């Protein structure tokens, strides 16, 4: 069910604009929630005592 890493070839658009970038500008909006992992790290403050 991944949406990304796949070619999308445009040959018809539901607007009257056929993908023409007026003014040499273009926008791309992307959301995902499948790759949203959160790693946790530590760092010691005193590396001496074994306890």
């Amino acid at each position, epitope marked *: 069910a991944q949406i990304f890493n796949k070619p999308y070839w445009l040959q018809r658009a539901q607007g009257h604009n056929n993908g023409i970038c007026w003014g040499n500008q273009l926008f791309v909006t992307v959301v995902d929630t499948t790759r949203s992992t959160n790693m946790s790290l530590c760092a010691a403050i005193s590396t001496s*005592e074994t306890t």
Partner: antibody, heavy 120, light 110 residues
Framework: QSVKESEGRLVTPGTPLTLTCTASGFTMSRYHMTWVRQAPGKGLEWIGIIYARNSDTYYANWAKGRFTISKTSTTVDLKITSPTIEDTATYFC????????????????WGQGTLVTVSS | DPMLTQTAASVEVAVGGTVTIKCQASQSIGGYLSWYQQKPGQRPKLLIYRASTLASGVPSRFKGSGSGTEYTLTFSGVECADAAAYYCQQGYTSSDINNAFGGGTEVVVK
């Protein structure tokens, strides 16, 4: 909030001795408890510690074999096994206000403290 | 064993002076450190913990700084009821130590 003690006694060396410590508002199974001893001159000496759900204890270096800290859900107390002459001083019971990780030795809300003395 | 010595008897100060009490530690304790005022007739009473965060019901004219192994406690505008005893105290909760977190005094202010 307020921390209460048991009333002091003038005792003889060679007799076991107790002091109970009850709290007013908070429950004691959440926080930690410890004991400090205020001697004349300077003296201000910490005894040990006891934790909440782990229920572990750690004493001072000189204080092993000499104090046993007991705790129920309603009351904490400490015990003395064999008193020596020079422990005529002032004892205090206080709550360790800590956070999710520390259990560091901040004693935020103290007790009023009573006078215990030994004499022969 | 982390040890804070506090071998410093306090100097005579007037109304409005500034006092630098310095508490040094042998081992690194992080920021976990407390301070107390002991009036010589009643129970001890705490001002600041973790060297930066003051307690409730205490004016903001007391200061806190220091990191690592050495720490300080300064304030200014000494009142009449500041004649007490002071104590720095660590929170490294170790087992084989015999801390007592001792040292510290304060003269009667003129």
């Amino acid at each position: 909030q307020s921390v209460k003690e048991s009333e002091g006694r003038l005792v003889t060396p060679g007799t076991p001795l107790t002091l109970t410590c009850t709290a007013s508002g908070f429950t004691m199974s959440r926080y930690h408890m410890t004991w400090v001893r205020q001697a004349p001159g300077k003296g201000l000496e910490w005894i040990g510690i006891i934790y909440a759900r782990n229920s572990d204890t750690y004493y001072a270096n000189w204080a092993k074999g000499r104090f046993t800290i007991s705790k129920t859900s309603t009351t904490v107390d400490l015990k003395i096994t064999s008193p020596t002459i020079e422990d005529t001083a002032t004892y205090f019971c206080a709550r360790v206000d800590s956070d999710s990780s520390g259990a560091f030795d901040r004693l935020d809300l103290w007790g009023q403290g009573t006078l215990v003395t030994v004499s022969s | 064993d982390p040890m804070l010595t506090q071998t410093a008897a306090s100097v005579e100060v007037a109304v409005g002076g500034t006092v630098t009490i310095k508490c040094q530690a042998s081992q690194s304790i992080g920021g976990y450190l407390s301070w107390y005022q002991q009036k010589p007739g009643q129970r001890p009473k705490l001002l600041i913990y973790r060297a930066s965060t003051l307690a409730s019901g205490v004016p903001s004219r007391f200061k806190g700084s220091g990191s690592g192994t050495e720490y300080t406690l300064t304030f200014s505008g000494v009142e009449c009821a500041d004649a007490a005893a002071y104590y720095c105290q660590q929170g490294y909760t170790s087992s084989d130590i015999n801390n007592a977190f001792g040292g510290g005094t304060e003269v009667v202010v003129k």
